[PDB]
Amino acid sequence: APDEITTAWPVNVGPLNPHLYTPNQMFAQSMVYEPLVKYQADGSVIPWLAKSWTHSEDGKTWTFTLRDDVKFSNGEPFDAEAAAENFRAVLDNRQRHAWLELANQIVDVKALSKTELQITLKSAYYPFLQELALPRPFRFIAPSQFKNHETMNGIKAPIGTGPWILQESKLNQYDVFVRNENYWGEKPAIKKITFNVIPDPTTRAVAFETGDIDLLYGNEGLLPLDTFARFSQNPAYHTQLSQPIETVMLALNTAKAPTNELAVREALNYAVNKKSLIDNALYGTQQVADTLFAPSVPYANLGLKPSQYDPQKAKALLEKAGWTLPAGKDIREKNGQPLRIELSFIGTDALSKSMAEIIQADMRQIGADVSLIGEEESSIYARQRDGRFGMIFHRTWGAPYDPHAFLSSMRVPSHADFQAQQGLADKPLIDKEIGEVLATHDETQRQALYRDILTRLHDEAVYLPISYISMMVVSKPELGNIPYAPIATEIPFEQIKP
C-alpha cells in the first residue's frame, strides 16, 4: 500500500473537538479542521477559508469574505453562519482561553450574509490574523455536530473541512485517518494514515526498526537521541533534523528562596555547561541557547549579553552575596541556611532526568545543592500552575506563538511563567507592557516594548536557557523528503509525496 502510511504518537489524537485542549492533539485537530487564514513560514498569513478581508480605520472591526465552494466532510455547507456559530461556541467557553488574548479581545462575531463574516475587537489587536491561524481554538466544526448548540460540553462527530477525516479511534491502540475525497483544496497524495499509540521513545525506535511503522515525526523527545544518530548513518533509513523551532529552558522561581535572589539566579546562569549538556544528554543534536528567544525570533534580535559557562564567575557572584562555604562542606550557606534548590521534572521522562542530573552535577560544582523531584505529569503541571517549584523545565511554543503569544501568557497567573516572575519588583510593569505591545500599532513603540520586556526578563535572570531544539524525522526512504510545517506543532502530512 504505497499511498498508505503508518506512524506513531505517544497518545491518541483525542476526540478531535476543535475548540478544546488536552487530550486533543493539536497536529490532529489541524488535520481535520481549518482556519480562516493560513500561517506562512515568512510570518504572514494567506487567504484560506476566507478569500479576502478588510478592516476599519481604527483596526477594531474586521470583515471577512468567505469562500463559497467549501463543504464539511459530511456534505454540509461551510458559510459565514457556520463560522459565526463556531466563534460563539468557542467564546461561550471564554474562561478556558484566557491564555490567548484574542479570546478576550473579540467582542462580537456575526454573519452579515452567507459569505460575509464580521468580527469586532475590544482594541486594535495586532496578532489578530496569526491567532486566527492557530491549530485551536478558532477552527470550524459542522454546527450540526454541536451538542445542544455548544462544543464546550463535547461534540458529536468530528466533522471539519480539512484534507483528512478521522476514520476510527481505539483508546490506547491506534487512530486512523483517511483522505477527504471531497476536499475544496489540493488532494493529498497519501490516502490513509495510521497512528500507533506508543508512549515510550525506545519502543517507538524499536517499532521503526522492525518495520511496524513507516514514519516518526516529532521534537527532541521523539526517540532516543543516540539511536537517532545511529539511524542517521544507517543507509536503509532516512532521517532529518530541522532548523531550530523553539527554546528549552529552566524557569527559576523569583518568589521562592533562594532563587528569589538575583545574584543566585545570575550564578546559576553561569554554572551550566550547555554545550557539554547537549553533547552529553542530547547527543550533540541540538543548539546551545543563551536567551529566552533565539536571535532569529521576531522582535528578539536585541544583542542581549550571554552568560557563558564560567564556574569561577558563578562562585564569585555567590560569595559576594554572602553565600559562602562552611568548613568541610561543599554546599554554601547564608544565615545558616544551605543553598538548596528543588528541580521539578516528569520522573518517567528519561531525557528530562538525564538533563536534570547534569544540571545538578554542574550546580554542585559551584556550591548549590539541587534536589531532584521527579513526579508524575499531573503533579508537575500542578506545581507549574501554583508556583510550587524552585526550578522547572520549560519551553517556548515555536512559530507563530513566539514571542507574542508566549509573552501574552506570562500575564496569566495559573501558568509557569507568571509564577516564576511573581517575585519581580517590575512584574506589574512587565505585564502592563505586554498588554501594550499587543495593542499598539506604533511599530517603533512595539519594538521598544518587546525590547524592554525581553531585556528585563534577561537581566533579571528569570530563565536559564538551555537549548534551541529541532524537529526530527525518521522514515522509510520510499516516503521521500518529509516537509516541515510553518506552525511548529503541525505535521504537514498532505505535503508528503512518495
Ligand X SMILES: COc1cccc(CN(CCN(CC(=O)O)Cc2ccccc2SC)CC(=O)O)c1O
| Residue 261 or 402 having the CB closest to ligand X | 402
| Residue 99 or 126 having the CB closest to ligand X | 99
CA-based nearest residue to 322, from 257, 264, 260: 264
Minimum CB separation of residue 296 from ligand X in Å reads 18
Q: Are the CB atoms for 391 and 344 separated by under 8 Å?
A: yes
Q: Are the CB atoms for 207 and 200 separated by under 8 Å?
A: no
| Residue 283 or 381 having the CB closest to ligand X | 381
| Residue 243 or 371 having the CB closest to Cl ion | 371
Minimum CB separation of residue 22 from ligand X in Å reads 4
| Residue 218 or 224 having the CB closest to ligand X | 218
77 Cβ contact partners less than 8 Å away, ≥ 6 residues apart: 70, 71
Minimum CB separation of residue 463 from Cl ion in Å reads 22
C-alpha cell at 429: 510593569
Q: Does 11 bind Cl ion (CB under 5 A)?
A: no
3-state secondary structure 435-473: HHHHHCCCHHHHHHHHHHHHHHHHHCCCEEEEEEEEEEE
Q: Which residues pair with 215 in a beta bridge?
A: 7, 475
Q: Which helix (H) or strand (E) holds 429?
A: helix 427-439
The partner in contact with residue 489, picked from Cl ion, ligand X, none with C-beta cut-offs of 5 to 8 angstroms by kind, is ligand X
For residue 10, is the peptide bond before it cis, meaning its omega torsion is within 30 degrees of 0? no
Among positions 372, 412, 448, 479, the unique one binding Cl ion when judged by CB under 5 A = 372
Minimum CB separation of residue 330 from ligand X in Å reads 36
Other Cβ atoms within 10 Å of 46 Cβ, number: 11
C-alpha cell at 195: 497512528
The partner in contact with residue 444, picked from Cl ion, ligand X, none with C-beta cut-offs of 5 to 8 angstroms by kind, is none
- For residue 397, the SS3 value is coil
Minimum CB separation of residue 397 from ligand X in Å reads 4
C-alpha cell at 490: 503541525
The partner in contact with residue 98, picked from ligand X, Cl ion, none with C-beta cut-offs of 5 to 8 angstroms by kind, is none
| Residue 184 or 397 having the CB closest to ligand X | 397
Q: Does 300 bind Cl ion (CB under 5 A)?
A: no
| Residue 321 or 359 having the CB closest to Cl ion | 359
Minimum CB separation of residue 181 from ligand X in Å reads 29
For residue 465, is the peptide bond before it cis, meaning its omega torsion is within 30 degrees of 0? no
The partner in contact with residue 372, picked from Cl ion, ligand X, none with C-beta cut-offs of 5 to 8 angstroms by kind, is Cl ion
- Taking CA atoms, 16 is separated from 48, 73, 135, 276, in Å, by 21, 14, 11, 41
| Residue 248 or 368 having the CB closest to ligand X | 248
The partner in contact with residue 371, picked from ligand X, Cl ion, none with C-beta cut-offs of 5 to 8 angstroms by kind, is Cl ion
Minimum CB separation of residue 259 from ligand X in Å reads 21
Where along the sequence are the contacts to ligand X (CB under 6 A)? 21-22, 26, 99, 136, 381, 397, 401, 489
Q: Does 371 bind Cl ion (CB under 5 A)?
A: yes
> Under the rule (CB under 5 A), what is the footprint of Cl ion?
371-372
